[PDB]
Structure formats: structure tokens, C-alpha cells
Amino acid sequence: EERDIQKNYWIEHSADLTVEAMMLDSRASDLDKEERPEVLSLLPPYEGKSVLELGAGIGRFTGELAQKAGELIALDFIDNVIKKNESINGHYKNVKFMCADVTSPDLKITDGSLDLIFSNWLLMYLSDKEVELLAERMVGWIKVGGYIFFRESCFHQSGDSKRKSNPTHYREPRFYSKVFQECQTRDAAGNSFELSMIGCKCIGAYVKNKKNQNQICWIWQKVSSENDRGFQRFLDNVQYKSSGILRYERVFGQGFVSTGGLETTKEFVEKMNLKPGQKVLDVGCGIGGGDFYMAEKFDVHVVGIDLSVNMISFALERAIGLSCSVEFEVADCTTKHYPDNSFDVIYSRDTILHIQDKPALFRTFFKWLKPGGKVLISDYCRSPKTPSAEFSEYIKQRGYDLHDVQAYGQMLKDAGFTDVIAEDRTDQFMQVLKRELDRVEKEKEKFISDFSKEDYDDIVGGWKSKLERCASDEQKWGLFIANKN
Ligand SMILES: Nc1ncnc2c1ncn2[C@@H]1O[C@H](CSCC[C@H](N)C(=O)O)[C@@H](O)[C@H]1O
Ligand SMILES: Nc1ncnc2c1ncn2[C@@H]1O[C@H](CSCC[C@H](N)C(=O)O)[C@@H](O)[C@H]1O
Ligand SMILES: C[N+](C)(C)CCOP(=O)(O)O
Ligand SMILES: C[N+](C)(C)CCOP(=O)(O)O
């Protein structure tokens, strides 16, 4: 049924075979004039390379692409439309034209043959499943080092034209970020590949003309993928499933997934003495609230990494249109490489409990920090006492690696850091837990409506259990600060 309703929409809106008919907007001409060159300027390098254009239409871009590309395939599922394209651009000897549906089980494209797959409005005309299947196909079609560009209306309809029916999917940007980042291929020799997100941004011509930032494009590059992705999947499927992230955010505060939300962030960031132009690495950046805060308040550049595809998908969505200097990447902090002496500050909030080999991580932090730089970490810890049975079960289910506060400080000293401060902030942690829990209980009706009774009970139960384990001299919270001399 999806194929029928989507094709019928394009049969109707292709009948006139004009740019205006495609644009579905009263200011089609001016939008085209301003946005066409912008899209072209955003494409990754493809001169002399092999390009596939999906949903080419009557050919707004096809002619331009043909002038640069070594080889071009222009594809559309409306035969009349691709015929019109060919009537105009067929004189380019390097262009092949196809009438095909990108979702077809019979569509044949040779794996590892393409340098760029380009579309501009396409995935919004596919079902969720169709997008997932096509994304995986696309990763196979491009060579390692090749690129994918796509652009969609997100959130809601952009154009002002009257439409009797409309099957378009207006998605949140995080859907596209997640689906493409989740793709994985493996060749017959056993080598694994995935995409790296090169850029994601809104189209300026539409911000200027339509006063909204819903026209969003993505650029991805196919790269070698050497790490097993099992732990990433555990994060995205269990503790940090999207609903888990959103319910945690409700408790902790907008933009945060850890202790105290903005309040603790303001307190800890102050200790950094951030100066304009400095560069901060945020290890475990989550949904980005602390990064936006540092960048906006202090005029620093923040490099944020997080292993969770869900987390980064949220962060990239929330970063759209912002003037502050932040970049986000899906990466494992235990395998990621940076040059020595890259960062003024390394910052991490309640993330390193997920890391099993902290000494190895801290030795890397020592290298990555500039001389004179600072490391600031908050993290879950334990008493030097042996954990109770209940505390041990919590630790096991979460997969946490917990140490006592003194020992954690010692690991920083052993990694080479100077003037290590290791503060037991468990009393503050308990005060924060109570405030967070009291707010949830007070706003119970709104919480259950937005989430569920189960979600509410999970959060209330989890916070009460933390209060108990903290009161009982078991679970701890530490703040650690040190310098590289
Ligand atoms: N499943 C599908 N397979 C192939 N083409 C499709 C398709 N779904 C939509 N299309 C085509 O995608 C185009 C979207 S309109 C944009 C056309 C062009 N990318 C440009 O920006 O000018 C339409 O021409 C439509 O017919
Ligand atoms: N090996 C690893 N590399 C990078 N991030 C990791 C990681 N292991 C766990 N994480 C991330 O650690 C984060 C903890 S949640 C806290 C996020 C943010 N610092 C905030 O305070 O709001 C999760 O988003 C999780 O995906
Ligand atoms: C221009 N276009 C019609 C192909 C894409 C935008 O669609 P819409 O957001 O107006 O529904
Ligand atoms: C660890 N965290 C603060 C990032 C998220 C919450 O974990 P938990 O307190 O539910 O175990």
C-alpha cells in the first residue's frame, strides 16, 4: 500500500513536469534559485567520480552533476519525469537514465561501484522500514571512502501549496541519524564497514525564506569499522534506549542524563576556568546539554563523543541551527584516537563507570591533554567496603566498573596527573537524588501521561534504591580534578 500511495502522490505532482510542480510552494522559483547552488556547494568531492542520483526528477541537479562527474546514473520512479530529464540532459554522454523505484527488490546496483549517492527529498517518501532497507543497500553500493548525501523535510510540511492528500513522512532528524549510523556491512574477506557522519545541517536558503530550520541534510562517508559493536548495542538497547534517555532527561533536567542537571554542571564547569577559544573534549557527551552550556557561556569549542547511537542522534537534532561551537561523534572513548596535546580540558560526567579499564583510559587522557590543561570527572563510585548482595546485583545488571574514591584518585596520579583532587560528594549526590525524586513524585500525573506507569515506577524505585545504597555507606559519587603539568 505504501508504494501505491507514494507513487500516486508523485504521479499527481509530476503531471505538469515543471520545477514549480515539484516544489509544491508558491515561491518555487526563488527557492530554487537560492537553494540549488547551496545544495551543490554542500556535496562532497565527486569530480571525475561515479555518482548515483536517486529521485532525480526532471533534472534540477542532473545537468550540473553531469558536468563534473565521470559517470552519472539518474533515477526516478516516474517514467515521464526521467524521460523529461533525459530529453534535456541526454546530450551528456556520461549520463545513464533509469526508471526505477529505490525500494524495489529487483533494483540492481553493483556493490562497491559508487563514489557518491545523492538524493534531495526522497526518504520522506519511504516507509520507516523502506528507509532502513535502502540505507543498508546504499552502504554496500558505495566504495570505502565513498559518500552518501540526503536531505529531507523534517518535523512538518515545508511548502504552502494545497494538497488533497499527502502521504509524506515528516520525521524527527534523529530517525535518519540513527538509521544510517546503525548500518553495518562486511565484505567476503571479513572486513567490516560503517558510516561516519561528515556533516548535518539545515539548508540556509529555507531558514532565510521560510524562517524554519526543518530542511536538513546529511553527509556520510563509508569507513572501516574494526570495533565489535556489541557494547554499543547494549547501551542503545538497554539502559539508553530512546525512552530510557528521555525519561532520564525528565528526571535530571533538560539536556542532561546525569546527576543534578544544569545545577551541578554550572558548579563543575566553573572549576575549569574556561577561556574563549579553548577546546574541551566531553567524554560521554550524551544528548549535549553540558556541551551547549560550555560553548554558549564560555565561547569554547566542544568536541563531544558518545558510544550510544541514540544519544548522538538526539544531540545532532538539538544542535541544528545553533551558533555555538560544538561537534558530536559516535565513538568509543577507549578506542578513539586523537593527537597528543589536543585539548585544554577533558570533561566527563557519570560516563567512566561504563569503562572497564580506567587506567588505560586515563593514560590516554594524559596524552590528549595539552600541557597546562585540566581533567574534570564526576563518576559513580563505591565504598571500600565489600558491596552488599543488592548493590552487587545493581552493578552487574548495569555493567558498571566501580572503585572507591581514593583509588580512583590514585589511578589519575598513576597515569601522570598532578595535583589530583578526589572529592567524595556522596552527601551532595543524596541531596540531589531527593530533589529529583520529589519533583517526579509531585509531577506524577504529568510523568505517567508523557511516559507510563511502568516508567514512573522504574524511576521512583531506582531513585529510592540509590538513596538506600548511599545512606547505607555503599554507593558513592566522586568529583575528580587534576592538571597536566
Ligand atoms: N521510491 C522512489 N523511487 C524513485 N524515485 C522516487 C521515489 N519516491 C519519490 N521519488 C522521486 O523523488 C523526487 C522527489 S522531488 C525532488 C527531485 C530532485 N531531487 C530535486 O531536488 O530537484 C520525485 O521526482 C519523485 O518522483
Ligand atoms: N566507551 C564509551 N565511550 C563513549 N561513551 C560511552 C562509553 N561507554 C558509555 N558511554 C556513554 O556514557 C554516557 C553516560 S550518560 C551521561 C551523559 C552526559 N555526560 C550527561 O551528563 O548528561 C552514555 O551516553 C553512554 O552511551
Ligand atoms: C519540494 N518537495 C516537495 C519535493 C519536498 C518538500 O515537501 P514538503 O515539505 O513541502 O511536503
Ligand atoms: C549513570 N547515569 C547517571 C549516566 C545514568 C543513571 O544511572 P542509574 O543511576 O540509573 O544507574
Mutation pick for ligand 2 pocket among 287, 351, 377 (CB with most ligand atoms within 8 Å):
351
CA 482 vs CA 291, 297, 376, 440, 454: distances in Å: 20, 22, 7, 35, 41
CB–CB of 382/472 below 8 Å? no
349 lines ligand 2 (CB under 6 A): yes
Rounding to the nearest 10 degrees, give the CA dihedral for residues 221, 315, 338, 325: 100
257 lines ligand 4 (CB under 6 A): yes
Quote the CA–CA distance of 352 and 373 in Å, as a whole number: 19
- How many other β-carbons are positioned within 10 Å of the β-carbon of residue 471? 11
CB–CB of 481/405 below 8 Å? no
| Domain definitions of the chain by residue range | 2-226, 232-483
The grid cell for 162 is 494545497
Report residue 34: phi and psi, to 5°.
-90, -35
Resolution for this model in angstroms, one decimal place? 1.3
Tell me which amino acid residue 331 is: A
Closest atom of ligand 1 to CA, residue 101: 3
Quote the CA–CA distance of 204 and 465 in Å, as a whole number: 49
Task: Provide the sign of the torsion angle of the four alpha carbons 427, 400, 245, 461, taken in this order.
Answer: negative
After what residues is the chain interrupted, C–N > 2.5 A? Answer: none
312 lines ligand 3 (CB under 6 A): no
Tell me which amino acid residue 386 is: T
| Nearby residues of 183 by Cβ (< 8 Å), 6 or more positions away | 135, 136, 138, 139, 194, 195
Mutation pick for ligand 2 pocket among 306, 335, 349, 358 (CB with most ligand atoms within 8 Å):
306
**CA atoms in the 13 A half-sphere facing the CB of 35:** 24
Label residues 148-165 b or e (16+ Cβ within 10 Å = b). Answer: bbbbbbbeeebbeeeeee
39 lines ligand 3 (CB under 6 A): no
Q: Where in 80-119 does DSSP place strands (E)? A: 95-99, 114-119
Q: Which residues are annotated as a binding site?
A: 55, 60, 76, 101-102, 120, 153, 158-159, 163, 170, 239-240, 248, 257-258, 284, 306, 332-333, 349, 380, 394, 398-400, 466
The grid cell for 138 is 546504499
CB–CB of 307/329 below 8 Å? no
Residue with cell 539502559: 239
By DSSP bridging, strand 114-119 and strand 142-153 are parallel
Considering only CA atoms, which residue is closest to atom 6 of ligand 1? 55
N-to-C CA span, the chain: 65
Asked if the domains 2-226 and 232-483 are classified in one and the same CATH topology, the answer is yes
21: left (phi over 0), alpha (psi -120 to 50) or beta: alpha
Q: Which residues are annotated as a binding site for phosphocholine?
A: 153, 158-159, 163, 170, 248, 380, 394, 398, 400, 466
Considering only CA atoms, which residue is closest to atom 5 of ligand 4? 258
- How many other β-carbons are positioned within 10 Å of the β-carbon of residue 337? 7
Helices (H), 71-213: 79-89, 128-141, 173-182, 204-210
- Domain formed by 2-226, architecture: 3-Layer(aba) Sandwich (3.40)
CB–CB of 192/18 below 8 Å? no
Residue 209 Cα, ligand 4 centroid: separation in angstroms? 43
- Method by which the model was determined: X-ray
Burial class of 86 by CB neighbour count within 10 A (0 to 12, 13 to 18, 19+): buried
3-state secondary structure of 82: helix
Closest atom of ligand 3 to CA, residue 25: 10
CB–CB of 472/389 below 8 Å? no
Considering only CA atoms, which residue is closest to atom 11 of ligand 4? 398
Report residue 320: phi and psi, to 5°.
-55, 125
Residue 258 Cα, ligand 4 centroid: separation in angstroms? 6
- How many other β-carbons are positioned within 10 Å of the β-carbon of residue 219? 20
Quote the CA–CA distance of 238 and 58 in Å, as a whole number: 46
Report which of 65, 76, 64, 61 is spatially closest to residue 14, judged by C-alpha positions.
76
The DSSP string of 216-251 is: EEEEEEEEE--S--HHHHHHHHTTTSHHHHHHHHHH
Considering only CA atoms, which residue is closest to atom 11 of ligand 1? 55
Q: In what order do the strands lie in the sheet with 215-224?
A: 95-99, 71-76, 50-54, 114-119, 142-153, 215-224, 192-202, 185-186
Report which of 215, 75, 219, 61 is spatially closest to residue 152, judged by C-alpha positions.
215
Say which CATH topology domain 232-483 has: Rossmann fold (3.40.50)
Quote the CA–CA distance of 445 and 456 in Å, as a whole number: 10
Tell me which amino acid residue 238 is: V
3-state secondary structure of 52: strand
